[PDB]
Amino acid sequence: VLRSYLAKYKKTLIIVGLFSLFINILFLLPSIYMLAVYDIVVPSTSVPTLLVITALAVVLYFALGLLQSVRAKVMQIISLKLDSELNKEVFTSSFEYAIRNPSKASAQPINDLYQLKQFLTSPVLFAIFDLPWVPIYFGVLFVFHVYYGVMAILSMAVIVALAILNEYITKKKLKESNELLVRSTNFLNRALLNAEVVEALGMRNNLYKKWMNFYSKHLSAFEEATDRNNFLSNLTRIFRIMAQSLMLGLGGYLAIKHEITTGMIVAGSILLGRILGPIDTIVNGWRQIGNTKVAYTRLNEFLKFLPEPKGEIELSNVVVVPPEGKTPVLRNINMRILPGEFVAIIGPSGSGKSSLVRTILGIWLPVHGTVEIDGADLKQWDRDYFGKFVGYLPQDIELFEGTVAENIARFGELDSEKIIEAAKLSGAHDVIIKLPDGYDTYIGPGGITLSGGQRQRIALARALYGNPRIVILDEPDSNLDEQGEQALYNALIELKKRKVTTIIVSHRIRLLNLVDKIAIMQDGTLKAFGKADIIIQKLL
C-alpha cells in the first residue's frame, strides 16, 4: 500500500507541473526571436528594434533559465523528503526481514533508494515533465499553416512509434540484466566471506564455473539490451535531424508560394525538434528510466514488511518452522522454565536445541502454540525495550564492526561503569586489557580482527550487559580456552546467586552440577525435561 503513498505525499508535482508549463512557454523565444528578426530584416530597422528584441531575448532567456533552474532544486528536495522518510524504514525493516527471508537479504534497497533519488535529479525526468505541455507547440506550428503540423502529427506517429518499439524489445532483457547483476553481486559477497578456504584449497576456479551460471546469463541480456537500445536511440536522434530537414522540404515546397512568411521557412523546423525533442533525449537515456523503474519495483516489495520481566518462560503446544524451512524443526514443545531457574539443554546436533533457543527469544515465530514470558504472551513485548532485559550469546557469536566498548554496550550510550562490570562478570575484562588499546580496540566486521576465543569472551560481556533478567548462552564454550571457560563458569555461579533465569546450551559436565534442570532434545522434540539430578540418573 504505502509503496506509492510515500511519494504521493509530495503534492508539489502540480506546483512543478504548473511550473513546467511556464518554462515551456518561454521556450518559444528562440522561435519568437526567429520570426521577430525576419520581420526586422526586410523592414531594415537594424539599429534600434533588433537590439530591443535582442535585449528582450537575452532578458527573457535569463527569465527562461531562471524558471528552468529552480525546477531542478525542487526535485532535489522531493528526493530528500523521499530519502529521509524512507532512509530509516529501509535500514530497520531489513534486519527484521533478513530473518524471515535469510536467502534474499542485502543492502540493495539502499542502492535502489539511491537509484530513485538519482532519477528525480536526472535530466531525463524533466524531459518527461516537458511532454505534457507539447500541444502548445503542436498549435503554434499549425496556426501559421496546416501543411506544416501534418508533418508534426505524421512525424510524431513515427517518433512515438520508435519510442514504443524501444521498450518491447528491451523491457524483457533489461529487467533481467539488472536482476542477474545483483545475483552475481550477492553470490560473490557471500563467497568472499569464505575467502580463506577458497585460497587454502584453491577452489577459486571451481567457484568461477558456479558463478558463471548467473553472470553469463546477465551479459547475454545486457548485450541485447544495450545493442537494441542503442540501435533505436540512434534512430530517434537522427530522425530528429531528418524530420527537421524534411520540414524545410515542405517548408520550401510550400514557401516558394507566399503561404508562408520568408522567415517562417526555418522557424517551422525548429518547433519540430522540440516536439520530437524530449522523446529523443528519453530514448538516448532510456536506461535511467529502465534501471530506476527496475530499482523502483525492487525497493517497492521490501517495504511491505512494515511490564518488567521477572524470569518465567513458558512454551505451550509449540511447533516451529524455520524461515524458508518447509519442514517443522520443533514439534509439540511443552516446557515451563520458572524464574531464576537454570537450564542445561543437552542432546545431539540434529536435536534442534539452538532452534529452541531462537524460538524462546522470539527470533523465530512458532506456527503453532505460543511462547509466554512471565505468563504474558510474547510478541506483545516491544522488540527494542525487551532487549535491555535479555542476554544472548549465539552459536556463531556475531560481533559487530566497532570498538569493544560499543559492542558490549550493544552500541548504546557508552557507560564506562556499566561496561566494566559487564566485562568483570563475564571475565572478558582480562582479555580486553591485552588488546592493543584495550576497550578502545577496533574490531573489524564480524570480529575478523579478533580470535574466536577472544570474540566469545567479549560476546559474553555483551550478553551480561545491563544485568538482564533472562540469559540464553548457546554453546559459549566453543573456541574458549581453560581461562575463558573458568571465566564463563564464574559468571554462571554469580548469575545463579543473582537469581537470573538462565538457559545454557552446553554438555560440559563441570557446569552441569549447578543446572537444577536439564532438557534433552532429540529429532526436534523435547525428549526429557526434569531435575538435573534425575536426568543424570537416566543417563547412566
Ligand X SMILES: Nc1ncnc2c1ncn2[C@@H]1O[C@H](COP(=O)(O)OP(=O)(O)O)[C@@H](O)[C@H]1O
Residue numbers in the known binding site for Mg(2+) are 354, 395, 475
Give min distance, CB of 352 to ligand X, in A: 4
Give min distance, CB of 69 to a copy of itself, in A: 4
Give min distance, CB of 26 to a copy of itself, in A: 10
Could you give the angle at the alpha carbon of 506 between the alpha carbons of 395 and 493, nearest 5°? 110
Binding residues: 350, 352-355, 395, 448, 451, 475
**Read out DSSP for 139-196?**
HHHHHH-HHHHHHHHHHHHHHHHHHHHHHHTTHHHHHHHHHHHHHHHHHHHHHHHTHH
* Interaction pattern, residues 451-490, with Mg ion; x per rule: CB under 5 A: x---------------------------------------
Of the two residues 60 and 333, which places its CB atom closer to a copy of itself in the complex? 60
Give min distance, CB of 21 to a copy of itself, in A: 18
35: which 3 cell numbers?
520570426
Give min distance, CB of 363 to ligand X, in A: 10
Of the two residues 121 and 395, which places its CB atom closer to ligand X in the complex? 395
- Count of CB atoms within 10 A of residue 135's CB? 10
- Count of CB atoms within 10 A of residue 400's CB? 15
Q: Which stretch binds Mg ion (CB under 5 A): 99-107, 204-212, 276-284, 443-451?
A: 443-451
Of the two residues 341 and 406, which places its CB atom closer to a copy of itself in the complex? 406
Of the two residues 267 and 443, which places its CB atom closer to ligand X in the complex? 443
Q: Where are the alpha helices (DSSP H) in 353-403?
A: 353-361
Give min distance, CB of 10 to ligand X, in A: 40
Of the two residues 288 and 395, which places its CB atom closer to ligand X in the complex? 395
493: which 3 cell numbers?
555461579
Q: Where are the alpha helices (DSSP H) in 45-145?
A: 49-100, 108-121, 123-129, 135-144
- How is residue 336 annotated by DSSP? E
Residues whose CB falls within 8 Å of the CB of residue 418, separated by 6 or more in sequence, listed in order: 409, 465, 466
Amino acid at 37: V
- Backbone Cα Rg of the chain: 35
Binding residues for ADP: 350, 352-355, 448, 451
Distance from C-alpha of 85 to C-alpha of 78, rounded to nearest angstrom: 11
The C-alpha torsion from 110 through 116 and 121 to 124, rounded to 10°, is 140
Q: Which stretch binds ligand X (CB under 6 A): 43-51, 125-133, 212-220, 443-451?
A: 443-451
351, 354, 426, 506: residue in contact with Mg ion (rule CB under 5 A): 354
For residue 334, is it left (φ>0), alpha (ψ between -120 and 50) or beta?
beta
Residues whose CB falls within 8 Å of the CB of residue 135, separated by 6 or more in sequence, listed in order: none
Give min distance, CB of 353 to Mg ion, in A: 4
Distance from C-alpha of 154 to C-alpha of 275, rounded to nearest angstrom: 12
Q: Is 358 in the site for Mg ion (CB under 5 A)?
A: no
Q: Is 458 in the site for ligand X (CB under 6 A)?
A: no
Of the two residues 255 and 472, which places its CB atom closer to Mg ion in the complex? 472
Q: Which does 238 bind (CB under 5 to 8 A by kind): ligand X, Mg ion, a copy of itself, none?
A: a copy of itself
Of the two residues 69 and 451, which places its CB atom closer to Mg ion in the complex? 451
By CB under 6 A, the residues from 317 to 376 that bind ligand X are: 322, 324-325, 329, 349-355
Give min distance, CB of 216 to a copy of itself, in A: 9
Q: Is 506 in the site for ligand X (CB under 6 A)?
A: no
Give min distance, CB of 450 to ligand X, in A: 6
Of the two residues 106 and 220, which places its CB atom closer to ligand X in the complex? 106
Phi and psi torsions of 528, nearest 5°: -155, 145
Of the two residues 65 and 348, which places its CB atom closer to ligand X in the complex? 348
CB 338 within 8 Å of CB 503: no
CB 317 within 8 Å of CB 334: yes
By CB under 6 A, the residues from 72 to 91 that bind ligand X are: none
Q: Is 403 in the site for ligand X (CB under 6 A)?
A: no
Amino acid at 25: I
CB 474 within 8 Å of CB 505: yes
| Binding interface with Mg ion (CB under 5 A) | 353-354, 451
| Binding interface with ligand X (CB under 6 A) | 102, 322, 324-325, 329, 349-355, 448-453
